[PDB]
Amino acid sequence: AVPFLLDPSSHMITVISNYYGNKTVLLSFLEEGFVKRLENAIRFGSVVIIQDGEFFDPIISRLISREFNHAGNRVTVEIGDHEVDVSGDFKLFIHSCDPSGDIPIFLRSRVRLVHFVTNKESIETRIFDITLTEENAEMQRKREDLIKLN
Amino acid sequence: LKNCSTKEEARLLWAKVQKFYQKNDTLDDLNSVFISQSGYLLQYKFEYIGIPERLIYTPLLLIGFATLTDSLHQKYGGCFFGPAGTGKTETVKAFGQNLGRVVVVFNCDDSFDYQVLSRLLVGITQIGAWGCFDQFNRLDEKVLSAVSANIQQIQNGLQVGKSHITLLEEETPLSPHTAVFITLNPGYNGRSELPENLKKSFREFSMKSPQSGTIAEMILQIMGFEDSKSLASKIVHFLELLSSKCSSMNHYHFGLRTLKGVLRNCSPLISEFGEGEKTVVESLKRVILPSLGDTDELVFKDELSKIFDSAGTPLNSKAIVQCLKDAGQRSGFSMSEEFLKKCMQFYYMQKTQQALILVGKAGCGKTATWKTVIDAMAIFDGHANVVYVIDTKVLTKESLYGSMLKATLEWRDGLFTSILRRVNDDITGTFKNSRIWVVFDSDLDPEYVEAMNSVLDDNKILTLPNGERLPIPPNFRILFETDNLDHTTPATITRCGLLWFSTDVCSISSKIDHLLNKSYEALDNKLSMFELDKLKDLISDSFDMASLTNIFTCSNDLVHILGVRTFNKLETAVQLAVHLISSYRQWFQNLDDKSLKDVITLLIKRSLLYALAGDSTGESQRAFIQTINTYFGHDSQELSDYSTIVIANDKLSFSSFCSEIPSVSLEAHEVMRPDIVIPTIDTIKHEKIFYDLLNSKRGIILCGPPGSGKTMIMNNALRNSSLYDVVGINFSKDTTTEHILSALHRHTNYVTTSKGLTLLPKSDIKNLVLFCDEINLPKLDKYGSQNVVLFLRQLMEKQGFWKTPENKWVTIERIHIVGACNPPTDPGRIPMSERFTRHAAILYLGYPSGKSL
Amino acid sequence: CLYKFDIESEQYKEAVLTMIGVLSESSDGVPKLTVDTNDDLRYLWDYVTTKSYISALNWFKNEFFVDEWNIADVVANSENNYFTMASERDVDGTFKLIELAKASKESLKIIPLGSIENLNYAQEEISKSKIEGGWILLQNIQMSLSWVKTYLHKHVEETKAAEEHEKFKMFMTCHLTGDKLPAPLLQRTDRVVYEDIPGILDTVKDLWGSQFFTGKISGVWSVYCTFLLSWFHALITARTRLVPHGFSKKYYFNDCDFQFASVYLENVLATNSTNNIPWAQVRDHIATIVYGGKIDEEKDL
Amino acid sequence: FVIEKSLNRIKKFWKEAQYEVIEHSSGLKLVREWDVLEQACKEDLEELVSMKASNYYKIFEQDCLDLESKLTKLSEIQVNWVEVQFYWLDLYGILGENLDIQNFLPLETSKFKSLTSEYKMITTRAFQLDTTIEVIHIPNFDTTLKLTIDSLKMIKSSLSTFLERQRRQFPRFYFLGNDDLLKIIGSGKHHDQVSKFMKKMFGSIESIIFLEDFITGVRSVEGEVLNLNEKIELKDSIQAQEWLNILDTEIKLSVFTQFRDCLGQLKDGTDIEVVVSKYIFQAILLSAQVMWTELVEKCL
Amino acid sequence: LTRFVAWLNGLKIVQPKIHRHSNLSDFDMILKKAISDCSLKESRTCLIIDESNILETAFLERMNTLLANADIPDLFQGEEYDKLLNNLRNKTRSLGLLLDTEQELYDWFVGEIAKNLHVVFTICDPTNNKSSAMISSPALFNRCIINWMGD
């Protein structure tokens, strides 16, 4: 299924860009040529990252939900009224900034949601890290290398 | 200065006043004259000013001038913040006038571009004129920021004195004669402020509504002073005492606005009597009295006679009343004391006020009131009248005032402006001598009156959204008929005359007789004159009112679904009975008074039942039947639950037998059909009453839960007859009037017949019937008024409507309004205004016993 | 509360809770009187019952027993080239900043953010002083907020090399009751609140000290009039901070009101005789145009 | 793979490229609805660019590279041609109509017409080719339009500088704007069409009364009539700025003259009812103010 | 499941292809095509509406006019009315019947729609207001059969 990434700071979008290099193509549900750029990126196996997940147009539905019409060598999918071919090298990520914005229920159901947000419990974790660093530094040191060397 | 105690007091009071000195010592003539105030000097420039209306000299005005000159001596910008209506822009204008300058005003955010503002700013920096920002707080952050930056550039170049300054990214010179002023209206939080950069370049001055005594005395001195001080004191004391004793009402406004209105009303009344206190008394009784309720009218009279008693007998007492009587005897109404009083109030207000407002309970005769007063003015002076009744909320602001299209920028008339050019643009006929009246029937809201606030102002000129200002003549009067004032602004009230209908105009019998005579005239087209004379004599003998009084009183002791007050039900009674009488009047008649009367009385009782309690539970209708039988004559034929009159087809018979049901048989394939119905003991009953109400041509409302047979009964009662053809529309949460119009074009055909300049009848020849299902579901505006219902009301009362795109009137022909709905207590249902249900008959239909099912 | 509720018992909790309800208008419950079990709490209640509120509120500050850091202490400890100290319009930390610069690392630079001229000069001196390494101040930055969202928002973010640049510190003056600043730009920089309120006599002397730098432009009577005006302005500015009793609302009187008053004084001295009787109008004007111009309530007028 | 299926539809679309052409009043024919074709061009260019990330196009590319090199220049001419269309249509309503406006500015119109002829040539020759793509084979089309928009911008710059310096000469013109200022510069031979705009650029006066040769004075939006001491003479060898500035000074001079006359009259003990009938309201107003303040100054 | 049962009964499945940049005009065009295929071409279509397909309230008004009445008077009016009438007479003569008046043709058109157009709604959570409006409308509620498959 498609993944949805929620980080206030878009640090993760650049992380994904770094993982995929030049194949990374950045789009957004708002821009003008979106409707068409996607139709191109899907036809040539470009890893696409949609920038604003809050707003979402259902013409991408047939792409998010794995619905495809099979043939001999080509696999097509209907978007709007155009039936565009799927590459195979193609990847799709969706990205949003604010948890305040609510995405349609269909998307949230069909998509795997992931929160890259720093909450108040991250404090409860990192203060433990720092406390053990400055209280018992040797065991905190060997903690990491235990798993690493495993 | 005379009454001053010492010389120090005199010199103190003199340093405050502007002093126009002159230098006979030097040359440079245009720089010779200067003005001294509070110790500072200002040079007089000789720009021509004309003869603009000068503000009335008050102490607050002098204090404002003092603050302005104190700001200008240090080369600081001027600025006041205060509520709308304090005339701060007017203060800037007057201050520029006294010093010989034409202050150019910047009405900002009123579709005001920034490039034009920059052009004006460069021009005013070069000319050396004075600029004033009217309501500088209303601006968009971008525009406000840029304008603030430039204004600060200017004021900085002034405080420092730089020869040329850089603003707008432009090195432009500066004339030291330039000055900036800012008026700040309060927003939603409170009194707005200048941007932090201007607070060190302007001097904010607070403004308070000046104490009414001073302005009142000054205005009285202007109009003719006789006793300005005493009259102002008495007027202020009288208004304070009225606010003191009178009940706390929402539309009551006794503030300084009301007394400025009273003085502006005194101005034309001085031409009638003279510059005495009697004129003040008459102005007070013309403005305040019509706006007060019965409980407060006597308070007004008492306090008036207490503070000052003037006259006893008014002028124009004999002619106007007789003209009103002659107009009413022809219209059909009666001349009670309340009707006469309100007509006289309206006549005494139409003279002064150009904009009038009539508020009262739904169907209080307000309509009749102003129509009769205008019809009588046609007789008194001889001036004809041209009336345009527009339902306010039926149309949008683009179709009423004017719509400009986005791309082509085509400015289109609309409605309100398309009927204003018929008086200003082309007066080819008799319009300079006639009286034009534009009435607004539907609910009025602030969003609609703000666009024409310039007409309600002293300007008497309609400002277009772009391009023009059309002046209105004194013949062009504007009226506002409505039922509530909860949404409007006190400013909008104090700009117009207000007429408060405390209670109903007349009694019951008078309206009953009016309706009877109208029905006689409606039947006069059919049948002969002699028959009409016989019918009227019979009706005069028949009922007197003593029996109907108790019936109408007991109708209130009942549960009415879709409530309508007893008064407005009269139109539903009379007409139906009249129609029934006519249908039995000829071809099948008898000559026995005892039996002939029995038939007339039985028909009248049936119509009375269905008019008063037709909207009841049906279980209460059977008790109201016995109530009617009680308060009617004891020997007259009583009424039963399923009473029916029987007569032979080709031969003359007479009897009364009930509960006769035919037998129906259908095969297996006819079980489910959209036009299938099983006649029961209540099917033919409901169908008969529905068909008789449709024959009366009156609007019909069927209230009840779903599937109760409303749809079924209404469909199968007309699909059987050929007279009427049905068109069905189903309302939803948000249905436009254009939805109805589009659902009608299929079965309707416009024609241009000379009788009605543009007629919209059915495409065939026989009657058409619109069935609007779920009529109380469509939603209302954010002010609480639904437009589709007002459109149906215009269809039923006015029998026509205004074309939304083409902007002219269209009368509908042989189109009747029937509509189904659920009780308003159900969720999702919207309460409908009585002004629409007034013209309709209400029939309640529930579920049949659980046993007939 | 957060600390003691969890550490101490529940008796302590309910006692301090009912006392805080007493300091509020919630309730006036019976306290727990345990001799020598809690004498700090007994001391707090002794503060509460004697009706002295400021000391009772400072008790919670004295129960953390921390040396509250001065603005100077934080500037010294903090290693950042960006400071924003907001403050109510009553005062401005500008002169405090002057004294904090002069005492160590004098390099004092003040920058008004006024006209386009001032803004261009400011954006020049910023990029020059971050290289030279002198303390720069941007006065009442709010007034040019539209310029901050375009220039300063970019400039401070990009200047991660300002930490690389020479030892330098930029300050910015805000106003709590005013236009809102962007949260990210506000978080990057260090934040402070200048709450140093001068006394009445101190304000009188601070106003009277700057007037003899003019030299001698007016007569001898004008000196007495300036003295009167200094006292008057000090008194009004002191009454401004009490907004329930005193003045109805909170009003602000700047040095510009003082300037206009003194200008009116010099004018009336030049135009009138040396007799001391014109006083009559001096009040009127000053009480209804100079100062009273801003007041919109009859009570405060 | 799909590269062929896409290139086929691309070439099919571009061998059907048509321009909506409709001729306005004068000989030139305008082209309607630019955005459709331009957006299609950009979309197909972006599709051809995205075709570079595929794997099944290396040998199938050269054709697509030629197509790209054609469409890039197509868009190049698209931008400049649409700019020329817009700027010419804007300068037309300013220079192509009036005779007086081109008599004041002979140079800029002498260049405007020389540009318009060549533009007619180019437009007709490009439309009669019956293929919007083939336009890129017409010689000297990109440079033609580049220098044509340069010339249009230069004409418009001369115009703007002229208008702003004209305003700076007579500052009241800042109040009017471009269209009404042009109308004033155009109806200068008549001198009587100007009155309608003084109501805007002065606010106080409504119209100006003439002898066709001189200027007896003005009349205000209120109705009062102001007569000038020196009626200003009008000749064909006169500019709008000129007599308008002279009038701007003469009005204040006449105000002062009437003011001093009224003040000297009332200082000699004449009733106000006599002065009302001959003097404007402003002069008598200021005179009454001055005499009143003087008399009350002595009464104090 | 709606698609499966519609394919079992031989119904042409019609799912509106909407998006954020979708106008009421495109919705009207899709409804027009479906109606004309069910009347002029006898397609027997099944229209599957979802809660994310109703962007605006005007869409719900169109659906109400499509259910309560078997036609949408707003789609075919003016010139389109005449074109539709022409094609309607074409198909009516093709089926072997000539209708006299102008209302008979439209009555046959209405019947054909009523007998060939099957509407199935797929709302998710009724607690949602945009979904609650789907059930609150009297037309949709009374003319549809309600089925519950919540959990």
Side-chain angles (χ1 to χ4, degrees), chain B residues 1 7 10-11 14 17-22 24 29-30 32-33 35 44-54 57 97-98 100-102 104 116 118-120 122-124 126-127 129 170-173, chain D residues 164 167-168 171-178 200-205 218-220 222-226 249 251-253 255-256 259-260 263 267 280-282 285-286 289-294 296-297 300:
Chain B
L1 288 166
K7 204 173 186 179
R11 281 181 271 104
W14 182 239
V17 180
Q18 273 194 348
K19 306 168 278 295
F20 300 66
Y21 293 137
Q22 189 187 22
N24 306 278
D29 302 331
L30 298 177
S32 61
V33 190
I35 289 84
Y44 189 94
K45 224 163 72 62
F46 288 83
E47 298 188 36
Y48 181 60
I49 69 184
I51 55 181
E53 263 194 17
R54 308 245 50 206
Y57 275 75
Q97 290 172 3
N98 276 21
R101 306 205 189 202
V102 174
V104 274
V116 62
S118 296
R119 209 177 63 253
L120 296 169
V122 177
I124 199 169
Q126 184 65 59
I127 299 161
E170 160 62 29
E171 181 100 335
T172 173
Chain D
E164 192 163 10
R167 286 192 241 265
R168 197 164 299 184
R172 294 295 177 109
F173 285 175
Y174 277 105
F175 291 1
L176 296 171
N178 296 344
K200 303 180 181 181
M201 63 177 184
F202 280 74
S204 182
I205 81 96
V218 293
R219 68 168 302 176
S220 66
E222 321 290 2
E224 180 168 283
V225 47
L226 175 69
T249 305
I251 53 167
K252 302 170 69 178
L253 295 174
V255 173
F256 171 78
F259 160 73
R260 67 160 172 83
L263 179 63
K267 288 284 184 59
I280 58 167
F281 158 77
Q282 182 171 352
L285 167 68
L286 188 61
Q289 293 166 343
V290 173
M291 192 194 70
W292 164 81
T293 201
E294 194 186 79
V296 69
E297 275 242 319
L300 279 168

Side-chain angles (χ1 to χ4, degrees), chain B residues 84-250:
Chain B
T86 55
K88 32 190 158 314
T89 53
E90 304 172 348
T91 298
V92 179
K93 292 169 63 179
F95 184 72
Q97 290 172 3
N98 276 21
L99 304 178
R101 306 205 189 202
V102 174
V103 188
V104 274
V105 184
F106 305 145
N107 49 277
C108 36
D109 190 292
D110 302 326
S111 306
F112 191 71
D113 193 7
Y114 171 75
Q115 293 294 301
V116 62
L117 195 276
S118 296
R119 209 177 63 253
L120 296 169
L121 276 186
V122 177
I124 199 169
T125 54
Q126 184 65 59
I127 299 161
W130 285 7
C132 179
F133 288 93
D134 177 19
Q135 295 176 338
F136 182 78
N137 59 289
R138 53 170 73 180
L139 276 176
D140 289 321
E141 263 288 322
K142 47 189 172 184
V143 184
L144 182 139
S145 172
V147 172
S148 165
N150 286 328
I151 293 170
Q152 186 186 19
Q153 294 298 135
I154 300 164
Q155 275 291 331
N156 216 249
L158 282 176
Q159 293 179 7
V160 177
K162 294 184 277 288
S163 181
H164 297 59
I165 60 174
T166 165
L167 64 94
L168 185 66
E169 299 159 339
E170 160 62 29
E171 181 100 335
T172 173
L174 180 61
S175 224
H177 296 74
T178 318
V180 190
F181 301 96
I182 293 174
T183 64
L184 295 174
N185 259 4
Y188 304 96
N189 327 96
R191 301 166 182 269
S192 213
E193 299 182 17
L194 307 164
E196 300 279 323
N197 51 20
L198 298 178
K199 306 176 78 68
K200 289 295 183 180
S201 302
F202 283 61
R203 287 244 53 196
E204 314 187 5
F205 175 50
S206 76
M207 276 304 296
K208 184 178 179 180
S209 293
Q211 289 194 7
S212 51
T214 57
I215 314 100
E217 178 180 37
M218 291 294 180
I219 296 175
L220 285 162
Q221 185 74 234
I222 293 271
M223 298 181 299
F225 61 114
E226 171 177 344
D227 289 333
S228 68
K229 188 187 180 187
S230 297
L231 282 184
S233 293
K234 283 184 290 182
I235 292 167
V236 170
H237 188 226
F238 179 65
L239 295 165
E240 192 182 23
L241 226 53
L242 281 184
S243 178
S244 183
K245 287 194 183 301
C246 292
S247 58
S248 62
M249 203 89 69
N250 270 9

Side-chain angles (χ1 to χ4, degrees), chain E residues 65-83:
Chain E
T65 314
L66 184 60
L67 267 75
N69 306 95
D71 68 318
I72 307 174
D74 298 309
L75 258 50
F76 310 99
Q77 59 183 6
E79 51 169 321
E80 220 65 31
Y81 184 85
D82 297 323
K83 305 176 190 299

